[PDB]
Design a protein around this ligand. Structure first.
Ligand code: SF4
Ligand code: SF4
Lengths: 417, 414, 419, 414
């Protein structure tokens, strides 16, 4: 038992939901208690969706302890009602403690579409694992070896529902691949139907956009479909360049860039940015966004990276490898009190992190920007707001620098009283 | 055309879209300044609290969750020793807390942790400074506001005994509402009067065979039971929403205390006229509009009653997650007799009913609200009605405002 | 004379520079004192430019008070030609040189150089920056726009985008898109991006999009008389006004309205349930005529705020604004004195204020939420990221910008209320 | 290898890119708490103060501008009546102000408004509470920091007479710097010592034939003149930048006051060792790098002296808007002999020399900084050196930091 107030990540079943809601024509059925539907809210409210997530719960209660029957009707009702191309079934943390076997129950029922069962270790793993696993499982269950499309094409892998800037990152990466002759085959799970998943095999290679929600499924595709997948995530001008280089090697195609709107390199080089130099930054968040943020901070903006860490166990190796290159020991924790402590010890001048760090930042009168989930409604915006590629860099620059000029502004203004 | 005492209520069971009682901790811990609510449960529970608490989570709130790990499952163990260590760690870094709540979850119940034995031993190890109780807030046994009910009911047995004839107003209300309530009752000459729960642990009420209590919130079945079990007697009354609700509520109390209609109409006419005028501003957009209410809180029947009789709305299907026949009787008596009444629910069934009915305003949870808007239906999210001051006279106009607003916005956006 | 701390607008010559810097292959020469170069900084720093503005000053001083001064502007004009060989030049006076004897007209005709030299009249004691911009652009246009044969394709001109324009860069980008989405291709865009040669080619466009009335109207009119070119009266800021713009273009060209709405999220966002408490919120709106008019329609008709005040510092837009504000049961506030604004806001007293870097400060002083909708503005509002106000991404961007300070206000309220 | 007293200085006159004296009001009003600076000028003038004040404009600062309207040009009536009205308006709305400054602009001088006659009449009308002065800050007459010089020089004639031999440190410095200075001098045994300007109008220094002054800032030619005209005597010294500059500055004072080399080395060794350690941090990226300075402030010669001698920089062309031969003598003595010196400028000509020179570091105005960066040259904008504390011992390392930083950032960004 661990006293817990703040949690960076949900239970794994929310990760499952994140894959389901990301897709179309797929119904997720979760065995769980009356009350388990509370996650509904994250999708309809934070992501401001216009449809209930394609998720249904058996919703058992006290009187029901005496329930395998319930999951069966739940699976049945979802098919009858929505006639989806495919389904997935799994257990909530409460139903993890029950007897009922999702695998046995769904094969008993025998429906005219595939039903993928999922293992969700609700007492050992969290949201991201949930999403990686569900996505992986769905892919193993539908991806067939296939003939390569005549034109050069790739898959976008790992874009999910409550993804920090997934919507616009997908838009942005599609653009820069297209500026280089590559057309997108299918994007999964975001936007994909189970039928789209069956057509994955025919792409030449895979863009792994988000390691924590797509890696597993990218590997399966490497052995199962002879599909290589990109290791570099294009956040930051430099990392975007190398990503493009990486694609060149994979495809043989020459690197072609439309930089007519890339304003970050000049902005940062510009005279105004000279006092950014040496500014101490603390960086926290999810493995992927932290690694990218640190390269931008050191090699692109000129901050001193003074602290680096993440909440997701899964990225602890790539992060330690990376942090090492800055003379820094990675901080791996999901205890916001460990972060609060580390920030205080590092005493940065800017903090880059999550909604939580936003708050810590305010507690300590420090400027602050948000770089990764978990995040509130604000950071699911109406305006175009990628993190990847060139517009990504542009956007990043404005977001980070803004709270510094405000700080300088508040300081100076009160200093003239 | 008004009266629903004899109308058949649809007892429905199936896919349910509701919050668990754990949610109640959110408004509840605010009221009880001395208390801390420790949920023994999973990370799911932690997550829910977080989602449910939005901004509050950053405001060091007096609730938390003892998240069960892998080895707390694996039998035997000191589930109890674990719990104890965390509780000591908690009470130390937090000596302000005077009463501690072990709030049971689904996982904790399915694992059959004896939280009562836990509360017992812990009361021992931390007396006299801290008293520790136990109660269920799980999805298995509790819907949303029902978590308030199970909490208070757990406190009742342990309350001080007395023989004085006193009035207890039961149910956590906003402090402005609580005060207005307290004032009017003093003006009517009823006294002395105390709330359950009280603002601090040291001024909880006493109960005895001569105690009278009246409910401010519909969802207090269990608490009623435990109070009656101690000898206390309820004043039946419809719930104080709107001008009519409040007057009828107050009158029920006055009558039980033998207050002349003299003093009653004196104390009450000013506040009443104020209340009725505030409501008129909304009568415009409200009258004639058909209403649908999904089950969330047990507040739906009396609020449907307020909306029909005082705002001229036409009821449709009014659903509650639980319907106490006796407590709700006053309000059922004044609800329009056409009303299709529902206890529990089967989501997809009820949505088909909704689609068919095509109502002008729908009250529902956040998970339903936007999807319904997208498909053309104006909605009013239920959860606002537990945090906004809505009871009694001064908040009556504001109450009707909660429901006019969405219609006015739907109108204005086209 | 009148005591002045804050000023919404520069002197007209700053407006001149806004036209010149917006252009390429055009040198402006301004007769003015040593010290007049201070506005250089505005382009270099706020618009973060990578080249010094195509502007040179005669730079006279104390010891020069004598026949020397006419001679100085002569050298200045001469040196700029010799050195940059521009396609065309313009020449006018600083406020201090407006008090001197030297005539820009006579002196440049005396010099007689191989390219046109447009003289400008800048009433520096009666008019301000935007006037300066409108007039310089007008003047340049009169001097260069010839009647011409209409292009085979349907094409239009973008008119009024200048240098220190609030969101001009990305507005030009955005309007270009929605015209292209509808079969129309842009002929030339001026002042921003154009050379004097492009200005000669204005005549061949079918019609004119008048993006910013306060910096392009004059030139649009000339083009109506001189080139039989009609010009759009509606400025596309806000989903509704964008629609009407598109309607207006349909009328003018005959082409059907075609929209790519795949990225338009503002209508749903504000229809969305989380927007309900925006209903009825009192907004005060101040800034530049054009932006305030637009902002009011979005507030009332699109987001659901109650517009509780409207005004502008821009005397030129007084009529359009009184016309507009009347429809809201409101009396326009026309002033350039931030103290009148401060007083009006107080009497109003709104819950949100939409305005200028000054109103951001007034808002701060008053502990009120606030968003910037119009010039004058600082570095931060000349962003690196895409940030138009016009068209569909405009709406999206506007919605984020306005809502943000309200959710922050509620957030800081609630969490202080929790201690 | 060091010595520039004999070097031909290029007196250039052509297109100039510099700020006028009005700018000086921006740092200057901060140091004189009692004072208000009223500029009589055009909107152009107002706009420049605005641009030059950036954020400060919103901090209710104690300067403004009576902007000339059309009627004020048009002949001699009420320019003075109108000015008077605005001053009365101003002094009532702001009764804390004890000194008011009519600051002259280009427009006001071309119009020949007699700001002097105005100051005198207004001193009359607002005595005893307010004394009003007049001085020019126009582009026609002053470059940037030269506005401080004209201001101070206007105050001098009116200063109280005294016969005590006192030290006056001339030039607005940061309060941090001013105190460090004041402390060291008291520790050397020099006293009593006062600043011009003083923090408040009531503690302005007195002047007499027995007064000694030393300059903290190079741009004080006029104030020197007016101070001497009253009988005071200047201590010549180089300007207190770097360890060398400060030491030599302090030495000059000590010498004039006959303080033993024992007492001097005692007070001075600690802060000196501290100073030269702080500068070593920067010696790394600084040594061997060529320096170019465009004309802005008159601080460029002594700063060039500090950069070459203490940080191992190589000088190139060092330009100043004005070069007082006698004041700048100590520092010219220490500048490396190769240095091409310029007074005034022709922008395009100087820029050709710049391009030709290809310097590692270029000091310049904001209007040139970015364009030069774009073209590949590392730059350090000059205007920071009037707001940031840079003088004396504790600020020395910081000073070197201002120049090292851009080079390390150009390095770092590739
Ligand atoms: S429904 Fe049960 S398991 Fe889920 S959050 Fe509520 S108490 Fe915890
Ligand atoms: S140079 Fe002269 S006219 Fe220009 S702002 Fe300065 S004082 Fe005013």
């Amino acid at each position: 038992m661990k006293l817990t107030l703040w949690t960076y990540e949900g239970p794994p079943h929310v990760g499952a939901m994140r894959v389901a809601t990301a897709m179309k024509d797929l119904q997720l059925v979760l065995h769980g208690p009356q009350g388990a539907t509370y996650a509904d809210l994250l999708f309809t409210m934070i992501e401001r969706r216009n449809a209930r997530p394609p998720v249904s719960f058996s919703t058992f209660e006290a009187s029901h302890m005496g329930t395998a029957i319930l999951l069966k009707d739940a699976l049945a009702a979802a098919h009858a009602r929505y006639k989806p191309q495919a389904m997935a079934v799994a257990l909530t943390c409460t139903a993890e403690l029950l007897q009922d076997d999702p695998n046995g129950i769904s094969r008993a029922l025998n429906l005219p579409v595939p039903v993928v069962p999922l293992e969700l270790p609700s007492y050992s793993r969290k949201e991201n694992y949930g999403a990686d696993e569900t996505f992986r499982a769905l892919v193993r269950a539908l991806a067939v070896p296939m003939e390569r499309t005549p034109e050069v094409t790739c898959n976008l892998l790992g874009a999910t529902a409550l993804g920090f800037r997934h919507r616009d990152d997908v838009a942005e990466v599609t653009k820069l691949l297209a500026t280089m002759g590559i057309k997108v085959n299918v994007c999964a799970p975001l936007g994909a139907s189970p039928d789209d998943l069956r057509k994955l095999g025919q792409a030449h290679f895979n863009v792994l956009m988000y390691p924590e929600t797509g890696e597993s499924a990218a590997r399966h595709l490497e052995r199962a479909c002879k599909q290589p997948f990109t290791k570099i995530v294009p956040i930051g001008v430099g990392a975007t360049r190398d990503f493009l280089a990486e694609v060149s090697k994979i495809t043989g195609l020459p690197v072609v860039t439309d930089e007519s709107t890339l304003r970050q390199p000049w902005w940062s080089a510009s005279v105004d940015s000279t006092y950014l130099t040496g500014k101490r930054v603390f960086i926290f968040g999810d493995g992927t966004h932290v690694i990218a943020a640190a390269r931008i901070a050191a090699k692109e903006v000129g901050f001193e990276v003074v602290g680096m860490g993440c909440y997701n166990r899964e990225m602890a190796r790539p992060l330690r490898t990376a942090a090492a290159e800055y003379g820094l020991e990675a901080l791996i924790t999901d205890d916001y009190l460990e972060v609060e402590k580390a920030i205080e010890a590092a005493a940065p001048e800017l903090i880059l992190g999550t909604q939580m760090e936003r708050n810590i930042a305010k507690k300590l009168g420090l400027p602050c920007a948000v770089i990764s989930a978990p995040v509130h409604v604000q950071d699911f915006p109406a305006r175009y707001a990628p993190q990847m590629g060139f517009e990504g860099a542009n956007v990043l620059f404005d977001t980070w620098v803004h709270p510094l000029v405000m700080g300088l502004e508040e300081h100076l203004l009160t200093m003239f009283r | 055309t008004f009266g629903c005492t004899d109308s058949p209520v649809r007892r429905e069971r199936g896919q349910k879209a509701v919050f668990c009682g754990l949610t109640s901790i959110v408004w509840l811990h605010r009221k009880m300044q001395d208390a801390f609510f420790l949920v023994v449960g999973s990370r799911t529970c932690a997550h829910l609290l977080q989602a449910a608490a939005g901004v509050m989570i950053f405001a060091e709130p007096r609730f938390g969750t003892a998240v069960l790990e892998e080895q707390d499952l694996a039998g035997l163990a000191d589930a109890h020793k674990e719990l104890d260590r965390e509780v000591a760690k908690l009470l130390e870094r937090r000596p302000d807390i005077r009463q501690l709540f072990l709030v049971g979850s689904c996982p904790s119940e399915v694992l059959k942790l004896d939280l009562d034995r836990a509360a017992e031993r812990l009361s021992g190890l931390h007396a006299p400074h801290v008293r520790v109780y136990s109660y269920t807030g799980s999805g298995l046994d509790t819907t949303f506001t029902q978590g308030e009910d199970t909490c208070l009911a757990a406190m009742v047995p342990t309350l001080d005994t007395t023989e004085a004839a006193e009035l207890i107003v039961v149910g956590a209300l906003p402090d402005v509402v609580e005060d207005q309530c307290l004032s009017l009752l003093t003006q009517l000459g009823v006294g002395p009067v105390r709330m359950l729960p009280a603002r601090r642990s040291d001024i909880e009420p006493a109960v005895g065979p001569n105690t009278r209590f009246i409910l401010a919130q519909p969802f207090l079945g269990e608490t009623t039971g435990a109070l009656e079990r101690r000898g206390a007697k309820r004043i039946a009354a419809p719930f104080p929403f709107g001008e009519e609700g409040t007057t009828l509520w107050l009158k029920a109390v006055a009558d039980a205390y033998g207050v002349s209609a003299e003093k009653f109409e004196a104390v009450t006419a000013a506040p009443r006229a104020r209340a009725k005028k505030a409501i008129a501003a909304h009568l415009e957009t409200l009258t004639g509009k058909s209403l649908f209410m999904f089950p969330d809180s047990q507040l739906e029947i009396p609020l449907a009653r307020f909306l029909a009789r005082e705002c001229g709305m036409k009821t449709t299907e009014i659903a509650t997650p639980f319907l106490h026949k006796a407590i709700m009787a006053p309000d059922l008596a004044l609800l329009p007799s056409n009303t299709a009444l529902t206890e529990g629910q089967d989501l997809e069934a009820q949505l088909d009913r909704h689609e068919a009915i095509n109502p002008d305003l729908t009250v529902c949870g956040l998970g339903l609200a936007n999807p319904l808007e997208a498909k053309g239906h104006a909605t009013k999210w239920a959860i606002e009605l537990v945090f906004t001051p809505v009871h009694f006279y001064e908040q009556a106009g504001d109450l009707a405002g909660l429901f006019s607003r969405p219609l006015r916005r739907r109108a204005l956006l086209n």
